[PDB]
């Protein structure tokens, strides 16, 4: 009640390190927290659902923004079969010169990663042909997460 | 006391070892912690300067030593952080010292103020200042 | 031949300092005064923590941004001409 596991006094009384280890482990078991009722459990579940939706929308928006900013969508749409899609750029202080020269692929001017997710084809099929569309979609998804 | 979990050996109990360990800055009880921390930081930074400049990623170029020196300073900063939090979670504002009260002979002696909020704060400040000064001195001596 | 006394428990439980010393400070008074006056601003704990965090972050960011391409191979970029893919992909 006074230590880190505020939802469980029994786990907060012991002096060993397991109090930390179990504290992370039982944070989502709402039926184990002391002084619990049905109303509180249902409301916490509802709030967790909302948070999960926000996280999903933020993830999709980030993917769209990175593809727009550091990708080659406009070069890929013209020749789909002879262009390798790009996911995001690579910045690494540990890279040597051979790694920098060898990781440059596609039309990029620096090291990049090839996207095996398959979102280029999905976005091309539904009717996106420019970077502005991707930017608008990212903005809309950020608004939805908020 | 034979029933205490410790043994008496020539290494652990010798006049030379006892004198050398009691004269170290970490065991001077009477001295205020700032002057001990300054010396500790100076020695630690002066020691730490070397390996970074001798085995760094740029150790073969002309910048090498300078870069290494910078790295050493950065380490000191991190170490200082690792001290500060250790105080905050350990010593409260109004509690007294928790050091042992009586010596090995049995005489009552004043407990060390290092195990206190103000004492540990002074120790950390002195350690940071001494570490920075020692790193600067080592760099200046090595590359001037 | 006794080892348990109820009147005091420091000796019974073994509360001693093995290598503690109570001798006066050997440092010179002038050097001590100089170090005390010059190392004062770092005595506070919260101020020291905030200053350390902000200064470290700012210095690291400034050094990373201002660094040139000679030190960092990543900032130098590629030099050789590009290469083709396995199936002729660009």
């Amino acid at each position: 009640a006074l230590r880190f596991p505020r939802f469980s006094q029994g786990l907060a009384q012991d002096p060993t390190t397991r109090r930390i280890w179990f504290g992370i482990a039982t944070a989502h078991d709402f039926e184990n927290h002391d002084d619990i009722t049905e109303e509180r459990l249902y409301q916490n579940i509802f709030a967790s659902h909302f948070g999960q939706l926000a996280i999903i929308f933020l993830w999709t928006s980030g993917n769209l923004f990175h593809v727009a900013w550091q990708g080659n969508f406009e070069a890929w749409v013209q020749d789909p079969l002879h262009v390798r899609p790009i996911a995001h750029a690579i910045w690494d202080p540990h890279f040597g010169q051979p790694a920098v020269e060898a990781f440059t692929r596609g039309g990029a001017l620096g090291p990049v990663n090839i996207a095996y997710s398959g979102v280029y084809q999905w976005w091309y099929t539904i009717g996106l042909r420019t970077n502005g569309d991707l930017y608008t979609g990212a903005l809309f998804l950020l608004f939805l997460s908020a | 006391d034979p029933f205490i979990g410790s043994l008496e050996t020539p290494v652990t109990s010798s006049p030379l070892i006892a004198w050398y360990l009691s004269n170290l800055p970490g065991y001077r009880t009477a001295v205020n912690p700032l002057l001990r921390g300054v010396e500790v930081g100076l020695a630690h930074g002066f020691f730490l300067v070397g390996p970074f400049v001798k085995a760094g990623p740029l150790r073969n170029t002309a910048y090498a030593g300078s870069a290494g020196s910078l790295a050493a300073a950065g380490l000191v900063v991190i170490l200082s952080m690792c001290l500060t939090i250790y105080g905050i979670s350990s010593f409260k504002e109004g509690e007294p010292s928790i050091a042992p009260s009586l010596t090995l002979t049995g005489r009552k002696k004043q407990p060390d103020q290092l195990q206190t909020a103000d004492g540990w704060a002074k120790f950390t400040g002195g350690f940071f200042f001494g570490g920075i000064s020692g790193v600067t001195w080592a760099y200046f001596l090595l590359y001037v | 031949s006794v080892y348990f006394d109820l009147e005091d428990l420091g000796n019974t439980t073994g509360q001693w300092d093995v290598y503690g010393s109570d001798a006066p400070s050997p440092y010179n008074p002038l050097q001590s005064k100089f170090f005390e006056t010059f190392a004062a601003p770092f005595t506070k704990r919260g101020l020291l923590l905030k200053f350390l965090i902000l200064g470290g972050g700012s210095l690291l960011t400034y050094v990373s941004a201002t660094s040139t391409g000679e030190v960092l191979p990543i900032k130098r970029g590629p030099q050789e001409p590009p290469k083709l893919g396995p199936r002729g992909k660009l």
């Binding site: 910045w91 | 952080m81 939090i85 | 972050g57 960011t61 990373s64």
Partner: peptide, 30 residues
């Protein structure tokens, strides 16, 4: 531009240190 050279060190190093310090202080607090 040069945004990655400013943002990668921030997320990689400074933020984990701040989060670790805050979490350690909150856990150790009584």
């Amino acid at each position: 531009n040069n945004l990655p050279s400013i943002f990668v060190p921030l997320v990689g190093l400074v933020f984990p240190a701040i989060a670790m310090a805050s979490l350690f202080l909150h856990i150790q607090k009584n």
